Design a protein around this ligand. Structure first.
Ligand code: CIA
Ligand code: CIA
Ligand code: MG
Ligand code: MG
Ligand code: ZN
Ligand code: ZN
Lengths: 313, 313
């Protein structure tokens, strides 16, 4: 492919040339091809290619696949969301002094995983339990790939390696279903308020890693007003287009969050979100590794721009 | 393909040579190949090929696709479930004097639809709202096909034809989600108890056509103790294997309906079903067209075998 060859025989800059190491980083400027070089870098400055000796040409045949297997039709749940979640994954990892808490497996899972937490989205979301169906279609799609020929970045691990990682990847993706993350967090939100925390304990390694996956899913909510707002207008575009669709085939009305109107109350809906989900998920996180404040803060900096906009309704 | 060519230059028996016209009909005896000749007959004795001048070679290129695009790995939600739901659709239509109540459009939708109500199942079901996700993956897969080249059985209709039918097909498939069918039926179950019934009214044509789709979904629940039991051990197989899986990756226990044990209480689980869902959905139907009693009865004939088996626990 005149695509793989290219990204193959190019030059993956660096964690610095690419500034992929900051909570303030955005996809906005660089072209897709580049969001490939970065990602490739991601694996690289993460030790994934070297330990698991990933074939250069396949990390790229994978990614490209991973990418092209995304729709630029949806207005948020597009490749640029996965990239921006792998990034925010790749940063709370380094500049967050979090990496030092995970194994080299759980780190391959989270990169591979995180670049697939929403693999084949179509624009069908919620607002409040479904047992994570949309999520198995993502994993089943995740796996569909990793197994694919010429895109097998795990074809270097061992039976108990490929297992232990598919157990994280899966359990990982399936954790982007806020439902679970809400029918859980409530507890992982006391290991803190009782400090009895501990990552050596498996279960807690679960609750953590999860609360971490969503933390990055919502990555864009703690981004510089520019980068952040520029995105909420995208998720908005989608949330509204989903109402429009479900008022054509079906004949239901919209749940505010999704009606092309109520656009004036979008703030308090953004505000409510943060207070209902964002805030505590990030502050609490912080306590794990204080090098995460950049998020919990960017958040509070945004939940004061909404409280502003909203104080005009 | 040595397949299509074959099913192409063969001989589609008849509604009688194939006995595809009775609630007591089963897939069990005939090979897949045949489950295609039947299905092909289904379109044929249904006027779909003649009105919509469907290319012989394509109904078959379609069908085969539709088929092959199913997994013989699942132990129920396999091609033989769709066939058996198209069938039960094809008979409550004829032998049920129901056909005389639908347009020629809503009849293509239902055949085309019905042979796709669960297009890409993997063995992930429920027991009690998800907004019909698995169902859009089915439709999106349903459509994926119909559009496919050489398998376009609608490439004979008109813009407002192909539309009107996708509105039915879609709304149709998406109605196999008992959830909706339960968050509805309750009313379509009063146009009867108040007789204020009426199919000329669109909305009611919905509720009807839906209640009818699930009617055929559960088709096998009203089948001769042999044909029926032979299947419940299959659906059982699946419901249990889904529990085994979700006690492997995940570490949850089983919801009875899905644990490899509790196999002794399978009757009262089969019993409660019928009473919670089957019974009413079939008796009430009957009133629409009394020629459907063969189902409401076969059901009652089964909900007395379970009451027997169960009266031994
Ligand atoms: C289920 N659910 C609940 C919810 O309320 N939201 C927020 C939100 C709030 C109001 C809105 C909205 C999104 O779109 C249109 O009006 C919200 N704000 C963002 C900023 C950046 C990236 C994603 C989001 C989301 C997504 C997130 C979500 O997925
Ligand atoms: C939520 N829910 C409740 C329930 O209790 N059931 C039944 C049932 C009862 C006992 C079982 C069972 C299914 O599988 C193993 O043991 C049952 N019996 C069938 C026969 C044929 C096709 C589908 C079913 C189902 C599916 C249906 C369902 O979807
Ligand atoms: Mg999600
Ligand atoms: Mg179903
Ligand atoms: Zn996401
Ligand atoms: Zn079905």
């Amino acid at each position: 492919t005149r695509e793989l060859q290219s990204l193959a025989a190019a030059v993956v800059p660096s964690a610095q040339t690419l500034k992929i190491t900051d909570f303030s980083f955005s996809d906005f400027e660089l072209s897709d091809l580049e969001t490939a070089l970065c990602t490739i870098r991601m694996f690289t400055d993460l030790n994934l290619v070297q330990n698991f000796q990933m074939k250069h040409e396949v990390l790229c045949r994978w990614i490209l696949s991973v990418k092209k297997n995304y729709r630029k039709n949806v207005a948020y749940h597009n490749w640029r969301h996965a990239f921006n979640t792998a990034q925010c994954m790749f940063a709370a990892l380094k500049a967050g002094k979090i990496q030092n808490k995970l194994t080299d497996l759980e780190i391959l899972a989270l990169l591979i995983a995180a670049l697939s937490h929403d693999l084949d989205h179509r624009g069908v979301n919620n607002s409040y339990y479904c047992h994570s169906i949309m999520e198995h279609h993502h994993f089943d799609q995740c796996l569909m790939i990793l197994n694919s020929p010429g895109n097998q970045i795990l074809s270097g691990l061992s039976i108990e390696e490929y297992k232990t990682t598919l157990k994280i990847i899966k359990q990982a993706i399936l954790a982007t279903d806020l439902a679970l993350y809400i029918k859980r967090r409530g507890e992982f939100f006391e290991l803190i308020r009782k400090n009895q925390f501990n990552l050596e304990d498996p279960h807690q390694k679960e609750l953590f890693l999860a609360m971490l996956m969503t933390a990055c899913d919502l990555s864009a909510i703690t981004k510089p007003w520019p980068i952040q707002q520029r995105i909420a207008e995208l998720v908005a575009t989608e949330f509204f287009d989903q109402g429009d669709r479900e008022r054509k085939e079906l004949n239901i009305e919209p749940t505010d969050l999704m009606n092309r109107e109520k656009k004036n109350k979008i703030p308090s809906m953004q505000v409510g979100f943060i207070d209902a989900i964002c805030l505590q998920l990030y502050e609490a996180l912080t306590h794990v590794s204080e090098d995460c404040f950049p998020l919990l803060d960017g958040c509070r900096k945004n939940r004061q721009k909404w409280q502003a906009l909203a104080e005009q309704q």
